Amino acid sequence: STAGKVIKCKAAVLWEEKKPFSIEEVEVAPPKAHEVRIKMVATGICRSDDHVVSGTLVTPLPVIAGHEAAGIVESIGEGVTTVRPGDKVIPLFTPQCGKCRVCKHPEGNFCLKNDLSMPRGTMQDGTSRFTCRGKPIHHFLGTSTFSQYTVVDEISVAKIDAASPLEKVCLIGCGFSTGYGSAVKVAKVTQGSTCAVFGLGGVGLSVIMGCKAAGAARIIGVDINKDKFAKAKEVGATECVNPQDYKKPIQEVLTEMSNGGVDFSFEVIGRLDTMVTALSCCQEAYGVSVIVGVPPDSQNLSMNPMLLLSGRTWKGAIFGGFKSKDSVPKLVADFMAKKFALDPLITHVLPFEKINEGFDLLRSGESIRTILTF
Amino acid sequence: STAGKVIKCKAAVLWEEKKPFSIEEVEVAPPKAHEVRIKMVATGICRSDDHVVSGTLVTPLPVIAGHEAAGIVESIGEGVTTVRPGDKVIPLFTPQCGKCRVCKHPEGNFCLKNDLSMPRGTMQDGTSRFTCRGKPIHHFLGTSTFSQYTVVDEISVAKIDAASPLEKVCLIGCGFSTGYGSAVKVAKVTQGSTCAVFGLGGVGLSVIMGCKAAGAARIIGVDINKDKFAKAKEVGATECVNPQDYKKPIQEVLTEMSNGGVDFSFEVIGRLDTMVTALSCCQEAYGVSVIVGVPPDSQNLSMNPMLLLSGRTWKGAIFGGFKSKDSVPKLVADFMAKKFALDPLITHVLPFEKINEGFDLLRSGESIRTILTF
Ligand SMILES: NC(=O)C1=CN([C@@H]2O[C@H](COP(=O)(O)OP(=O)(O)OC[C@H]3O[C@@H](n4cnc5c(N)ncnc54)[C@H](O)[C@@H]3O)[C@@H](O)[C@H]2O)C=CC1
Ligand SMILES: NC(=O)C1=CN([C@@H]2O[C@H](COP(=O)(O)OP(=O)(O)OC[C@H]3O[C@@H](n4cnc5c(N)ncnc54)[C@H](O)[C@@H]3O)[C@@H](O)[C@H]2O)C=CC1
Ligand SMILES: CCCCC[C@@H](C)NC=O
Ligand SMILES: CCCCC[C@@H](C)NC=O
Ligand SMILES: [Zn+2]
Ligand SMILES: [Zn+2]
Ligand SMILES: [Zn+2]
Numbered sequence: 001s002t003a004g005k006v007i008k009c010k011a012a013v014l015w016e017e018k019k020p021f022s023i024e025e026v027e028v029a030p031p032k033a034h035e036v037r038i039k040m041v042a043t044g045i046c047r048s049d050d051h052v053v054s055g056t057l058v059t060p061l062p063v064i065a066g067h068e069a070a071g072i073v074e075s076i077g078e079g080v081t082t083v084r085p086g087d088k089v090i091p092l093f094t095p096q097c098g099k100c101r102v103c104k105h106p107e108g109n110f111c112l113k114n115d116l117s118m119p120r121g122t123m124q125d126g127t128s129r130f131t132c133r134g135k136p137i138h139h140f141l142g143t144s145t146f147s148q149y150t151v152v153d154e155i156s157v158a159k160i161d162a163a164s165p166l167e168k169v170c171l172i173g174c175g176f177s178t179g180y181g182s183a184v185k186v187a188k189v190t191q192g193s194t195c196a197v198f199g200l201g202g203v204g205l206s207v208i209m210g211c212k213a214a215g216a217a218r219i220i221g222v223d224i225n226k227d228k229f230a231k232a233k234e235v236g237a238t239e240c241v242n243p244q245d246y247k248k249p250i251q252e253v254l255t256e257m258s259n260g261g262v263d264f265s266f267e268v269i270g271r272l273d274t275m276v277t278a279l280s281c282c283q284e285a286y287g288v289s290v291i292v293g294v295p296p297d298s299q300n301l302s303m304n305p306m307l308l309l310s311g312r313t314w315k316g317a318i319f320g321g322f323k324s325k326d327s328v329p330k331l332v333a334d335f336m337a338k339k340f341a342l343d344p345l346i347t348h349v350l351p352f353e354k355i356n357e358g359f360d361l362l363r364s365g366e367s368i369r370t371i372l373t374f
Numbered sequence: 375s376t377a378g379k380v381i382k383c384k385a386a387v388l389w390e391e392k393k394p395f396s397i398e399e400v401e402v403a404p405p406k407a408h409e410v411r412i413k414m415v416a417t418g419i420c421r422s423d424d425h426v427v428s429g430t431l432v433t434p435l436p437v438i439a440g441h442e443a444a445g446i447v448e449s450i451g452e453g454v455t456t457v458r459p460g461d462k463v464i465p466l467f468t469p470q471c472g473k474c475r476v477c478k479h480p481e482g483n484f485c486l487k488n489d490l491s492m493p494r495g496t497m498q499d500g501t502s503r504f505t506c507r508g509k510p511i512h513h514f515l516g517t518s519t520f521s522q523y524t525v526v527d528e529i530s531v532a533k534i535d536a537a538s539p540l541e542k543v544c545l546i547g548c549g550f551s552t553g554y555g556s557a558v559k560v561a562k563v564t565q566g567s568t569c570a571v572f573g574l575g576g577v578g579l580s581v582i583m584g585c586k587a588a589g590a591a592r593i594i595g596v597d598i599n600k601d602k603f604a605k606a607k608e609v610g611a612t613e614c615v616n617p618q619d620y621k622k623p624i625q626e627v628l629t630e631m632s633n634g635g636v637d638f639s640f641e642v643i644g645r646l647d648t649m650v651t652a653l654s655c656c657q658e659a660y661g662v663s664v665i666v667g668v669p670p671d672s673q674n675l676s677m678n679p680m681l682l683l684s685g686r687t688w689k690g691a692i693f694g695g696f697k698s699k700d701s702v703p704k705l706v707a708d709f710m711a712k713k714f715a716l717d718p719l720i721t722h723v724l725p726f727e728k729i730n731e732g733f734d735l736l737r738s739g740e741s742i743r744t745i746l747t748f
């Protein structure tokens with residue numbers, strides 16, 4: 001019944017950096033050609049949403065953030081062919097247009113239609129579907145899921161299993177898939193290897209799940225918050241280390257523990273120093289290090305290229321390297337088939353209107369994923 | 375006739391940085407257990423030997439440099455099994471002990487017995503076989519080929535085909551195998567791909583040959599010395615660009631030329647800035663960039679890790695990733711079967727006594743490889 005009509009609903013608007021989200025009445029326009037309007041069912045609080053608040057990630061403000069979510073299609077614009085009203089869907093913060101050089105490449109997934117490289121904070125057409133008191137509100141990564149309703153381009157949404165539990169599978173929209181894919185697809189962790197995972201939040205735990213799935217023999221978790229260690233061990237870490245406990249640099253500790261360096265390391269925090277530490281702690285001749293964390297905007301790291309000349313491989317990836325529209329439905333199918341677990345990531349569940357309590361929990365160190373429900 | 379005796383012969387000794395080599399009489403001790411004394415036949419002048427002179431590459435002085443060579447075994451120490459007197463051999467500046475974790479790894483080649491990471495400038499037993507003016511003289515990478523005779527450890531020498539032409543195959547001891555393998559083994563260049571090669575000296579020309587062997591569709595040579603272009607095209611470059619001809623930075627030029635970035639880029643110069651530029655010019659989502667050049671000692675580069683987060687792979691390698699003792703004889707066999715060419719790399723041939731002229735030719739931009747004959 002709301003098809004073709006403006007919807008008035010509640011959304012969490014970020015008006016300014018370093019402020020709480022503000023629950024506002026917003027107007028959500030109907031979808032234009034090749035756009036899809038979605039009724040939100042669940043959305044995760046990812047550290048990347050916090051990065052918009054802290055200014056770590058720069059994107060036009062004011063904004064509706066949120067990018068890790070699942071919902072049900074309320075209506076479709078003209079020409080939409082991949083979803084229908086009533087379908088369960090996951091919004092895709094990395095699009096899959098299927099036509100650019102990256103979408104056509106066997107390995108690439110950073111589709112050229114992304115809104116990450118030079119953020120505009122709009123729909124593909126350069127405009128917004130959100131207004132608050134006659135003021136346009138920016139979109140975030142073409143998703144914007146901190147809202148009862150959002151509108152996304154068709155290349156930024158995937159249809160998923162009609163029977164999937166949205167309060168869990170929303171994590172496949174970012175944290176799980178990023179961490180799991182970073183291990184299994186980007187690093188290509190091998191059976192019997194030794195892995196080191198820096199940062200034991202939702203994404204790092206998912207990296208551990210991937211390392212375990214790949215048959216790593218040793219998975220060393222690294223975090224300065226020792227409260228994160230229990231859960232890391234539950235999901236597959238064989239040992240955990242807190243750099244604050246040592247009188248020497250943790251790259252040295254890890255090199256000693258691993259008898260000369262690890263096979264695979266992962267930076268899942270977002271600090272320049274831990275990116276270089278994670279590179280250094282992998283074995284100098286054949287080690288691989290994968291950057292997953294998002295560091296502060298426009299800041300460069302410093303490193304000695306001899307670390308690479310000896311034979312190391314350094315790479316990064318977005319969304320675990322998964323081509324998003326192809327992979328998300330398959331990952332949901334795999335979850336339904338009990339191929340991996342999502343409950344270990346979910347520590348808190350709150351109604352959407354308690355979003356700020358959810359961010360308080362993340363910032364305090366107490367939560368992994370808070371899921372916000374509608 | 376010389377077996378078991380100290381040999382008096384000529385060598386090019388480097389007494390101090392930034393000075394000419396001194397051609398003088400040295401005493402070369404007989405080989406101890408598991409060592410091999412070699413009569414040198416031919417040695418190339420590689421930019422890395424010049425880096426020892428300039429202090430770009432730090433190794434203990436005084437030293438007998440030279441590492442790209444071929445010769446004939448004069449005698450063997452007790453317990454040597456892999457070569458015999460009279461055998462043609464290539465010294466291996468990257469050893470292959472066969473026993474360490476790197477030698478046993480399918481991908482690694484930077485054997486832990488190397489003298490590169492923490493240079494001692496000795497034999498494996500921590501002593502020197504060279505005396506000059508009554509003083510011990512350091513070895514260089516366990517090779518030291520700027521001498522009529524040298525002594526190497528058995529893990530640092532490979533027996534090659536008895537019919538091979540030593541005045542050519544000395545290049546397999548460094549510059550050819552390094553560039554070729556950087557393409558075919560390290561980057562794993564694919565059929566139909568676009569490559570960019572920064573630096574068109576002997577090693578860069580060998581990278582081109584590797585890209586051609588791999589079936590690259592486009593191979594773009596980059597050099598600030600336009601005199602290098604003609605040879606680069608002869609060996610497979612489809613285009614050459616001089617950064618000095620353009621107003622925009624060359625990574626921008628190359629990104630444009632390649633319709634969004636190259637599949638594979640190679641830094642084959644040894645500058646921090648071109649390492650970052652070569653990384654930047656590979657396609658952001660699936661590009662691969664290989665560092666081959668040796669930069670100034672102890673200096674760090676600065677880069678934005680967003681270059682990696684979008685999906686790029688950055689790696690480096692020593693000696694083209696080849697396990698040295700396994701690979702060198704096979705490379706010689708392939709050369710004898712004309713699977714690749716060495717003549718295009720050889721622009722000058724001089725007697726050993728004219729070593730300083732050979733270094734002048736390199737420094738002036740005139741030569742690719744000068745081969746010194748004994
Ligand atoms: N590449 C991609 O596509 C994606 C990147 N991200 C990024 O991944 C990172 C992790 O995200 P979440 O798991 O949601 O964050 P989180 O904040 O829950 O986890 C980070 C963990 O790092 C630990 N930590 C902080 N400083 C540390 C230090 N100096 N040493 C060791 N541990 C330290 C914290 O105690 C925390 O447990 C963030 O930067 C986020 O923006 C997340 C999803 C997608
Ligand atoms: N990784 C490894 O195992 C090895 C590394 N090396 C290193 O590879 C590098 C190349 O060796 P060669 O080919 O013997 O040296 P080379 O000196 O003959 O060639 C370097 C080329 O770079 C060009 N060049 C200089 N500045 C440039 C700039 N700003 N932009 C573009 N081109 C520029 C020069 O004109 C020259 O043609 C050296 O640093 C050497 O030490 C060599 C062999 C083994
Ligand atoms: C790991 C750095 C490799 C550099 C090897 C050079 C010095 N060898 C011969 O040119
Ligand atoms: C290339 C950097 C990728 C970062 C992607 C983040 C912002 N998205 C989800 O958390
Ligand atoms: Zn996220
Ligand atoms: Zn695309
Ligand atoms: Zn070894």
Ligand SMILES: [Zn+2]
Binds near residue numbers: 420422423441442548
């Ligand atoms: Zn060399």
